[model samples]
Each structure stands twice: as structure tokens, then as C-alpha cells.
Target chain A: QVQLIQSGPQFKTPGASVTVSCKASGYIFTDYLIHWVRLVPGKGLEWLGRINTNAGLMYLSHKFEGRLILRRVVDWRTPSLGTVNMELRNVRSDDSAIYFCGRVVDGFNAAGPLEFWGQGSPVIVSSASTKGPSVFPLAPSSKSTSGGTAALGCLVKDYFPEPVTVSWNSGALTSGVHTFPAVLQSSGLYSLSSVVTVPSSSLGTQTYICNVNHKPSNTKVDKKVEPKS
Target chain B: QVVMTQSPATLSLSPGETAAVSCRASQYVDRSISWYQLKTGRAPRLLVYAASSRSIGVPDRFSGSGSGRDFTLTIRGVQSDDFALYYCQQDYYWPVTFGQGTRLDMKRTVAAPSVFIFPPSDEQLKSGTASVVCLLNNFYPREAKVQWKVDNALQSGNSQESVTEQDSKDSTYSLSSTLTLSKADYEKHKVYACEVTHQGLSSPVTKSFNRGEC
Candidate 1:
């Protein structure tokens, strides 16, 4: 079975910070992306960010801007990816949460949620407390291509347990698909890719929609498609 | 970002060996150091923090104590539940620092095995019904806390035990706690756990024990 093994326990005092590691085994490390999530003592889970092992790129959530850091260690074995360290700094009571390392599979233009996850590292913030932040960037627009396949990208600050939807419109035609990225950036930054295949005859002035259905509210972005000559 | 260093990536020990691991910050972390315990396929829990404060629902055998630059995370007596990785963190600064981690495995060695703890044997427990002990030693000045738990449930109203600080130039130290449960409670194969906490840090270190023959 594909697995992500993480480092062991820690002992610390208030105002202290810590870092843990999650090493992947059983599959090609770069073929998939790693994402980090936080679960406090009793609260629900929150997305911290993602890292693309292939590109060495990182995307982070607003709240995790400077707190969460990821680094990839070198490996001697081929097809086998090495370890990645996820570090949490300036620990407070509110910072206590379970830290998880996860990977997304590649292949489909549009992927789904995290396909694999590590057993997760638990953290209990002593004197530190932090709630989800309210500041988030607006969702991006998406467009589809007729006959061939159309693609759209959506950027978000953190991970949401809910599924995000992408929709399409052609004159009077409309379709939707749930898609995710094969790779994610560090610090909870994520970009989702969505696509749809259409017949040549159906191509023309088609508009694609990206809708995010999450807690708080729903957000939508649109993209236009043109038939190939 | 401050850099933290940990030694002996993997530790091997026997059932009756004593193990100690250290987490060192590049800069002075002040009173903001914490520790955590992470097992295979599960999330981590708190063990020590506020330099030495205990979190609610932690056990006594696993104790934390230390101050300034140098710090240590110790397991008094190695138990089956203590076989896992251990880490130390500093929360005093904006960009935190973390020790790589020291794994405690069930191998026996003579070179001061990095990972080892001795849980009281069942015979020892029944003979005297005395307190079982755990220790947290060689820590620098940093904010931290401690706690105890049993069978996934939080424990309350336990007695507070004091620790002695070893006066090294680095200011290393240790602490302890004791629980007085009836011998009947010990026969039920209960699991006892300890947790620690620190500021600006998100993870804590935890240690657990099963009733064994002393």
C-alpha cells in the first residue's frame, strides 16, 4: 500500500516551536503532490498549503504565510521520492492540531481530492491559539475548448473539505465536473484544473464556469471556448 | 527562520534501558520550547511546554524540565508504548525551529542507546504499590506545558510533582508527577499518557504506558 511515514513525538514548553517530517514510500514521490492540513485538539481540520515536489514550488494559506515551511530532502534511489519536512513555528495553545501529509495523483486533466494521506502528526498548542483566517483571494476564471479539451485553473488560499465544481456553457449547453490538481504548492496554496471533451459539431461560443461550494458561501468564475478551425 | 538540530536520527533500546534525546535551537528560544510524540499512522499529541507547565489530562511518568539554549526530552523507563519518534521545538521566534527526530526502537545496544525507557514491571507495582516515574530533562528556557491522559480520556485532579533544574551553563532540568489509583485500577490494563505544550508551536510530545510486571 502507498504510505507516508512521519517522524515521532516531541516535548516542548510554551512559546516553543517544532518541526516534523513525513517521508513517502511505495510510489514515485514527484508523480504526486503533497498537501498539509491542521486539526486542533477538538476542532475540525483546516488546510495549511501544498508543495509540488516536481517543481519545488510552494503555495501557502494566508494564516500559514510564515508559520508552515516545507523542504524536500535528496534521495539516492530512482523512482523513489525522499522525505519532506513540514515545520510549524511559534507554537501557542491554539496551535495544537494534527498535522497530515497527503498526495494527489496525476493523469486526468482534472483530479479529485487528496488520494493518499499520511497517518498525521498531532499537535496541541499550549498557550497559543489561532482560528481560521477570513482573508482569501477571489476564485479565478475557467474556459473550455470545443471538440478538443478545455481547461480552467482555480486558485485558493487553503484546503476546503468540500468539493469545488467547474461548469461549462455552450449557447444553450451546460455541463459540470469536479476537478483537482495533480500538484499543490506549500503553505496551503492550491490551483485546481478542470476539463471537458466536446464533439466538433458542439463547439461554438461555449462558456465554462468554476464554482466553489464551501462553508460561508458559493463562488463562481466563467471562461469562454472557441471551436477549432 | 531559526535552525534546530537533533541527533541520532534512530535510537535502539531494550525493555529496561533509559533513553534521552535533545533538541537544540540555533538561537536562544527563551521560554518557548515544546515536545511531541508521534506514532505510526496517527497524529501527534502534546507532552511538555511553557518550559515545564503540564497540559490538562497528561500522566506523571512522562515529565519535562529544562531552560535556555540546551534542551532534552527523556523517557524515564522505556515501555512498549514508548517506541516511536520524538521531537523538540522552539516557539520563541517568528520562524520556528524543529529537531529532526529520534526514533526509539526495540533493539539493544551498549553505547548509551538513544531510545529506551523502563515501565515498572507488574510484580514491582503490586509488591510496593509505589509510584512509577518518568523524566523530562536537559531543556533550555522556553515556554511549555504538560498533561496526562488514560485510554484516550483526559485525567483530572492528579497530584502536582516538582522537578529539579540541573545547574549547567545551559541550564538543563527535570520534573515529575504521581498518580494514586487503587491497585484494582492497575489490573485493568489501563494506558497512561503524558503531554507537553509550548507557544508559537503547533505539536506536542506524548508518552504512554501499559501496566506491566515490575
Candidate 2:
């Protein structure tokens, strides 16, 4: 079993910059999947991004633009980028939360689904009251023509170390949808996109609505759309 | 935004047959695709890449060609080794996905292994430290079960094994194992035995030998 060890709590004032490091050891580091997770004081589980070692291929993920950014992935050995660091710049009151350096359980050749995680640094942005996480098109729905279901995308944000849950009050949009996953920005913020497809026909509702359920700060955002006229 | 599907799910074959495996994309892929051949108990290998480019050292008979949604992996004369699963991978999207593989089915000929036993040495018997050896050769399917027993009771194995070597000429595997025991135990309980079990055999093939048999 490979283990991930991260830095302790960090106390940063507003408008400050901080970097947290997670060191990975034991087992073959690249043989498993690794991600940085966040549990904002009140929010739910937030995914930052993945630690890419040296896989000779390309993949799709969030750019993490204009936010807390990917500083660098360093280590003592070759092919071991298990030790990765992310820097939170232009800190705000919403950036307060427990950061986790984690090892996710991926299948045979693929890595991911965020099954395991641990706490890293708790970034505190004092002086400002904790504001609820922000949601950008929290529930973005779309139509698909496959085994016949509708898929949607959801993007959410954090005030500080917030955990957000995403769900659909309509059909089962949680499964069957292809997700680009949520990525944390170097701006010390979190971003997510959920693309799921549910069965559609004249028999179902004329419209589909999805909800971004975030606990901790209690923020609910929804995206409801009708079939193309 | 690409999804691929492999067709002719199962290539039923006898001997003289050509297998034409197909990969259909959900949309335009522009030749940015690859095909792989995977056999049971073996790692998948690239048979063709870039839609039509054959992998290095791959036979010329296995070729790929297609554009946009239609692609094909056609084996001119499918051989015994070519009778395996084939998959198509899409490079046009972020999530590099592989279509569920196309399987190959046919009657197989498995080669049974030959077993030989060698008894303890004279010097080892005098020193009360002896080892019995088992030689298993000409086995097909690569996997086998081996064991050492004394008077039907299994030993806690201080046994050493040689690296499994495969014969290139006949495409079979062979290995040797030395089971260590004491001369006093051998004299007290009788002979030492070595057993080998493989898919080629209905039951285990065990060989027994004593000092006199040496």
C-alpha cells in the first residue's frame, strides 16, 4: 500500500499566498492514482486536480486558470512526482478549508474516482467571515442521443475549504454522464463540471433540472433546461 | 468527443481463414487511432497505429486502414497466434478509451509436459543433507503447478527453482526444481516425490524415486 503524507495546517491572512506540499511514498507511486482533495470547514468534498507522473499520453482536465495554481511536482527519484505542490495566490476569505493529499483507487489500467483521501493543510483566511461557496451554472444540462439519455455539466466554487455535493432532482444524471471532473485553481478556488446523460423521450419531463447541493455553507444552485425548440 | 466500437465480436475460425476486425467511431477521427492484439496471459501489443501504420516488427499481413468513422484491422491469413482478442483505441479525445475487444475462438492443441525425477546424491546422503530434483519439460500454456512431497506429506519447502525457459524452436516451456530435505528423513520414511500439474493434464503427474533409483 502506498501512503501520502502532506504538510500541516497553514494560517494565511487575506491577500496572502501559500503553497502546500504532499509527499507520496511506499509502493509504486505511478502504479496508482493521486489527487488533492479539499474539505472546506463547512462545505463538502472538493477535488483540486490530479498529480500526473510521467504517463506518455495526453488527457482532459480543468486548466485551473487564474486561481491557486500548480506550482510544481518534485521528488527525490525519477518517475516519482508523487510529491506535488500547489500555490494559493491572492487569497480570499473563501479559501479557508482542509486540503487533502490523496491516493484515489482506479481500476486495472485507469486511475481515479477519488475513493481515498487525507487532510493536508488547513488554509485559514481570517478577518473575513466565511462566505458560502459560489456556483457557476451549478447545473448545466444538455441533450444526448445515445442509449438515449440527457447529460449535464455542473461547475461549483468555494469560500474556503468547502465541500460541495452535486445531484439531479430529475432523472439519474449522476450515472452514464461523462464528467471532466472538478479542478481547483491556483487562485485558491475550486471549479467543477459534471456531464451526465439520462434517458430522454416524450414520456419524461419536458425539461431537466440539476442541483448543486453544497453543505457546510448551505448553498444550492440549479440549472434547468427544456428540450431544444 | 469520440467513442469507438469493435465489431464481429467473435471471430469463429477453423484453419484457413482471414479475420477482418472492424472498429467504428461515433464521429470523425482523422486516422488518429490504434489497434492492439491481446492474448490470454499476455500483455496487449500494438498491431497497428495512426490508423494505418503497422507497429515495428509486426508482420506485414496484419494491416489497418480507415478514415473518420470507419476503420479496420484485417489479418490476411489469421494464424494460431493471431487467434486472440483485438481492440481499437481512440486518440481523438482526452479520455483515451478502448472499445470492448473482439474475441477469437477455435479448437486449441495443448502439449502435455514430460516429468523426470532424480534421487539424492551419495555425498548428500552421508552428510544427512540431500535434495531431490524434478524436471518438467515441453509444456504448453506457460502456467503450471509444482510441488514436493515426502511419503505423501508436503514439506515446508526449502526448495529452489530454476528460471522457467521457453523453447523457441517448439514454443514450449521447461523448468527444474530442487526440493531440499534430510537424508535421515528419507531413509526413515522412504522415497521423495515431485509433482507437476498443468492444464495439459487431467490430474497431477507425480514422479517418485529413492536412493536405489538414483
Candidate 3:
């Protein structure tokens, strides 16, 4: 029954500060500690820090020691209802990532798998050098040997402001779809891939198209692949 | 991969008997061992942490005891749902690893349980508080969820959910949940529903107790 509702997306300029709040419900606000984590476009999960209101303890990661500020706010009338805020100081282009506030499974030690999670609050540090995604042609990753399923993959790369939606044209084939998170590349751009499965018979007759929607540039691109008999 | 070994690949026991599974770490793990329960179609449940402390809402029958390289997860009284898979994990080192797994089983197979609800007696309602009991009988696989509702609102926090137990005669599992409400509120509400869900049923089965109808 634990719920963690985070604030909506935030757009801030470089050298600005932004505070992301996550309101807690279904559980006591102070009983369990809340940990803030960041999902960088290309990089995986990075734990920022954790704070507990009951013990008045804040354990910040070594990287975010001085860069991050955490606070627990309580309601005047309802002491149990409150929000945990993560304040980022002097945000930079590298700070453009999805920030999430999560809770450990139970009130065990400071370590455990997060049983509950926030949908994610993305912070986009708008800069002059922002770029949109360039989608590659849809290619067949795997072909069926004995009339099973074939997989088609689409790659999106070089996106600076990293939120893009990828889907297949066939709405009926959604169960076997797999999409990966954006990975930061060495050139300071982000890249991601999405793969969808289709019947082996459809590979020759059906035209499968991969669709990419980059909201920043208002661009919509689709790449189709059809195998010839 | 870290070398974590769990003994007794498979254990067969009757309900109400004590079941114990062991885990050994290749090196010193100290008191950083945690236990988890895994079942099909359900999320892995954390049972114990830091070697001995139980997680929130975990039954008292489930306990973890041991330290250093050796640890044991003991169920004082095995319940119908306790017959699943258990794994011990250690996070004291760089790469966290979990034990292979210990499978808990029973000799006989189980069937899906039937759900029933019993309304409060007139005498108890006259005393100002009404107690309603929802019972699930003859279910197998131990995984079931029961929820109470008054009118259209979900009820929680104060309801008493009992542990799943096996019937000695048939070896099937049975459990009951009790909800206490004021008699005035019960009379004021149009319907009191007990919703039950299990892996066996295609959809959740809801039974309502209406004083006017029944």
C-alpha cells in the first residue's frame, strides 16, 4: 500500500537550482528512509543519497556530498503526511537526468531492494547545444529457424535532451516488445534501442515500421523493413 | 559469481511442522545475510534482514538465525503458502550474491481454496461492534489475498489477517480474515464485501454480507 508520488517534470537553465519533492502516502513518513536516485540518459542507476526524518540522518553519496541538499517537510495539521525534497544546487548540463525517490523494501538496515518507486521526475537543464534523436533504419536482429518469432530492432542516437518514445507500427504485437534506456555515449550524446517481435511468416509479407518521437525537436521519424521472398 | 550454497535442494514437510533450511557462504559474510521468499507469478518477498530481524508484516513463525559464514531460515510452523523457494543473499561484499535456492514442498498436491464470508451474530451486533469473518478453505499453493470493503471503500490497517494453516484430514490450506466495525456503521452501510484472489481463480471472487438481503 506504500505510494511515492513525485513532482512533475522540471525545466531549468544551467547554473540554476531546482528542488524535486516526493510525497509519501500509505506509510508513516518518518518510519522508513527515502533514497534519491538518478537515471542518466546513457548511464544506469546512480544512488544520490538517503534521508530519514525520524533519526534526522542524511547519508549523501561521496559524489553528491556538497552538490545535493535533502530535506523532509511535514504538514502542520497532519504530522504523518509530508514530502521528501532533493535540492540540486547549480545544475549543469550533466545534471539533465531523471531523478527518482524510492524506499527500501522494509525498515531494515540502510540497504535493501527498493520495493516502491516514484514514476520519476525528469530535470532538463535547457542549454543552447540541445539536439534531437536520429533514428537508424529498422533491421532484423534475429530470424526464426523453425517458424517461430523474428525480432526487429531500431536504434536512436545523438539525442542531447534525452526523452524519446519508440514503438512499432503494429499495435497488435506489443507483448514481445523490449525497449532499453538511453545510454550516454562518449560524444556527450545519448543513444537507446527498442526491439519488437513478430511472427516469422509476417517477415516476408508484413511491413514492420519502427516509429520514433522526439518531443524536443517536434520530430517524428519512421523506418520500415520488409524482407523479400 | 560468489559461491553461496543452500542445503537440501528440496524439503518435504507437513503443515504445522518446523522447517529449516541452511545457507553457507564461501567466505566471511558476517551478519549481512538476508532471506527472501520466491513464488511463481509473485514478487520476491523479503523475510529477514541482517541475519535475524524480520521484515515488516512477516509472520512470527518465520525466523532467521546465524552469523559469520553460516545462516539458517527456520519456519517454526510451516504454513500452506510457506512451501515455495527460499534464497539467502549477502550484501556485505562488493558483488552481492544469492544462494542457489531451497525448495519447500509437500507430499500431496493442493487445489484452489473456496471463499466464504460469515456475518456477525445479532448478540455481537447488539453490543455495538460487529465482527465479520472471511474464510478460505481447501486452497493449494498458499498464495492468496483477501480484502474487506464497506460500501465501495477499501478497508485496511485494522483488519486481522490470520496465517494460512493446513487441514490435518485433507492436507489443504485454510485461512481467515476478520474485520471489526461499529454496529451503527454496519447498519448504515449498504454492503460489506469480502474480496478474495488466488492464482487458481480467473478473477477475484467477492462475497457480500447484506443485512437486508441475508
Candidate 4:
């Protein structure tokens, strides 16, 4: 018999993102295709996309264009993906639904059913959402040299749902963390900037990690920065 | 889509002898077919059904024949107890499909065993320990039988066992039965035989084993 198992629950706020995974067992890894399906709270199911285990081909439905992205990692049996904050951004009372992952048996051509299915993770997006002060860099350009200090300007407001954190890394980061508070803006948003001083030897080309953590939902975002000379 | 095929799809046999049949399917059906001795238990009893059907009420002598798409079901000998359902099904299919099975009953004997053991060993003696075992190999769903008999009567109680076919060049079913008697019962000139009956055809075959000899 074939079985599909998935990870558990994730909670994110508006403008924040989270990802989930699914694993397969019982048969040859490459013998079947893994497909993702979405079932909104109290709504019918929607076809997200399918990842072919043999050729690493991914076909997504139009509705999932920017929201769902699938990528194969390690082997044919383990595929991963990063779903944008749409579920968070478009947060509505009715958007609180559980999602599931499924797989189609290689030659099971009877009625074209998903022979195997995985339990899903439940995500609930709410108001009282985490709103971090906007941040901007006053530097000459986004690109900077190694060993140089990069100033990332930040703004905070009356609605600072949570304190924010910033870090820099090599383009890929998981969650965000907090840093020193900055100046406040006229419209009630706060403004602030934190400087990351890099060593001259590590200047112009090294990657740094920047993270921002906000409250209410405790949302976070990490961006990679490359400093120029 | 995996396609399966069986060879000789049909076979003919005579009473008092043994017949061998083969099944083959294209690609690999894996252990997807269940062998069954149909028509006996209820309207549809499973005899070696999934992979090999063996419904609860199936007789000890009736055995499964193959693995994956290639399999065989065998009957030890032609007996009043041997007539009934015999079919092969693909367990992999949500709704399974069965193969036309070989039927076994009473038919004229074209060939007789050179060595015949009748009035089987048990009737000749009263007490003591003795034993006989029947082993059948490479079966595909052809109607055949293998068992031990004592003085024309089948040993009342015996041990029966079966195993799934091995993953080899050819996939087939294997089965065996054992009859035990006390040592005091080792009488001279005692006889024991293994029998088989083919489906759709009308004949029962027998192979006898003699005791108190090499």
C-alpha cells in the first residue's frame, strides 16, 4: 500500500510567509507524481499544481501563479515549496482553511483520482496583525563594498504592531529578528536605521543576514545584503 | 499502464496424472493477483484470491498457482471435494478481473502411474507413527492436486502450507501438505498418493507413494 504524510500547523501574520512539506513511502520514489491541493475553509478543493517525480516537471494552475511555487530537492520522493503570504496578505475571516498534499499513482488510470493523500497544516491569518515600521537605506546604492558599514533606514509609527529586526545573508533566510528602534514618521509610522559594519577584508562581496520581527503575529522577513567598497 | 499476459491460457489433462500450466503478463504486475478456488465457500469463496485466493472454506488439497500476473492453482487429485470455483484475479485493479480457470472432475485416464500405491498405508496398520508429505512447485493457475491418501481414503487430519512465488525469471505458486502416523503404524505394502484435477476439463490425476520400500 502507498502512503503520504505531511508536516503540521503554521501560524503567520499579514505580509508574512510560511512553507510546508510532504513525504512519500511504500513504493518507488520516482514511480508517482506529487500534487498539491488547496481546500479553503468551507470551500471546494482547488488544484494547486503537480510535481513530476520522473522529470522534475512542475505544472501549476493559473490561480496559484505567484502564491505557490514547487521545487524538487534531494530526490524524486522529497519535493519542497515556498508559498507566498497570499494566505496572509488576503487574510479574510473565511480564509482560515486547512491545506493538504497528495500523490497520483503512476499507472492508476481508472478515474484519475489522487490515490494517496497527506493530512494538511492549518494556517490562520488575523487582524491585530503585526505591522513593522517601514525601513529604507539612505546609502548611495543598494549595493555596497565588503568591510563597509551599511545604514538601513527604518520608520516606526503609532501602529507599530511589533518591534522589527533586520539581518543580511546570502539571498536565502528563514525568519526575522529585531534590532534597535529608529525615528518615527509624521503619519504615525516609525522611522529607524541600524548599521552593520563589515570588516574591510570581508568587504565588497560578502553576504550578510538582515531580519525584522514584528508583534501581534510576530511576523519576520530576512534579506541578504552584499556591501560594495 | 502495466500490461500482463499468461501463456498457454488453456491446458488439457487426464485422470490419475499431473498437469502443469503457466501464466505471464507484460511489464511487472508485481504481487497484484489473488488466486481463489471460487464457487465453494458462499456463492463466491476466495481460495487463493488476492495474489493467491484461499477462502475460509477451501479444501486443503486445493492450492494457489502463481505470483503477479503469472500463477497457477492446483488440486492434488480428482475427488468429489475438488469440484467448484477456480479463478485468478488481478488484485491491483480496484475492481478485479479474473482469468478463465481450468476445471477438474472425473475423466478417462490416458496414462496410469507405473508405481501405484492403493489401499493407502494407513489401513494396513493400526498404531505407530508414520508420515507423508506432498510438495508442488512452479504452478500457474492450472487445475492440479497434491495430497496423501491412506487405503483409498485421504488422511483425515494433515498440515497444509503455502508461500508466495519468488521474485525470479518466472513467478509461480508453491504449496505442500503433510500426513503423520505413529511408528507402530509403519505397515508393509502401505500406499499413499498425490492427485490433481484440471479446470474446465473433466479428469482427475493421481500420483501414489509407497512405504516400506526405497
User: Which candidate has the top score in TM-score?
Assistant: 3
lDDT per residue as tens, model 3, B50-130: 889888789999999999888999999898878787888776763456777876867466476655555654335555666
Tell me which of candidates 1 and 3 scores higher on TM-score. Answer: 3
**Interface DockQ per candidate:** 0.03, 0.01, 0.01, 0.00
Cα lDDT listed for each candidate: 0.51, 0.58, 0.70, 0.44
User: Measured by C-alpha RMSD in angstroms, how accurate is candidate 1?
Assistant: 28.6
Question: What DockQ class does candidate 2 belong to?
Answer: incorrect
Residue A60 error, candidate 4, Å:
1.5
Per-residue lDDT over A43-142 for candidate 2, one digit per residue giving the tens place of the 0 to 100 score: 3334465545445222223434466555335455654446667776777777777776655334413433333344457776654344565443311112
Highest DockQ model number: 1
Q: Estimate, for each residue in A70-177, the C-alpha lDDT of model 1 and write its tens digit.
A: 887747767675688887777865675577776654441122134456777765433322212112111111121122332222222233222345444422433322
Query: Runs in model 1 with CA error above 4 Å?
Result: A108-112, A126-229, B1-214
In model 2, the runs with Cα more than 4 Å from the true position are A1-229, B1-76, B79-108, B123-129, B141-143, B155-169, B181-189, B198-203, B211-214
- lDDT order, best first, reads 3, 2, 1, 4
Which portions of model 4 miss their true places by more than 4 Å?
A76-95, A108-112, A128-229, B1-214
Per-residue alpha-carbon lDDT of candidate 3 for residues A1-229, written as tens digits (9 for 90 to 100):
6778998888777798999999988877777878776766433345687888666578885777898888988767765676898899999878988887777766454564455677789887765356777655433312213235554556565687668888788465565455654554434566665655567677667767878888887878887755321
Clashes of 4: 108
- Stretches of candidate 3 exceeding 4 Å from the true structure: A1-3, A9-18, A25-63, A89-132, A139-153, A160-182, A187-189, A194-206, A214-218, A226-229, B1-47, B57-66, B69-214
Q: Write the per-residue lDDT of candidate 4 for residues B36-82, one digit (tens) a residue.
A: 33232122234544444454556766666666557666656545444
iRMS, all models? 29.6, 30.2, 24.0, 36.4
Q: Candidate 1's residue-wise lDDT over B1-214, tens digit each? A: 6677776776767666777777777887666766667664465555766556544445665666667777777777778777776767565654334566666766521211011012333333555432333333333232235666667676676424333322223333334344434466556556665665543234666655554412
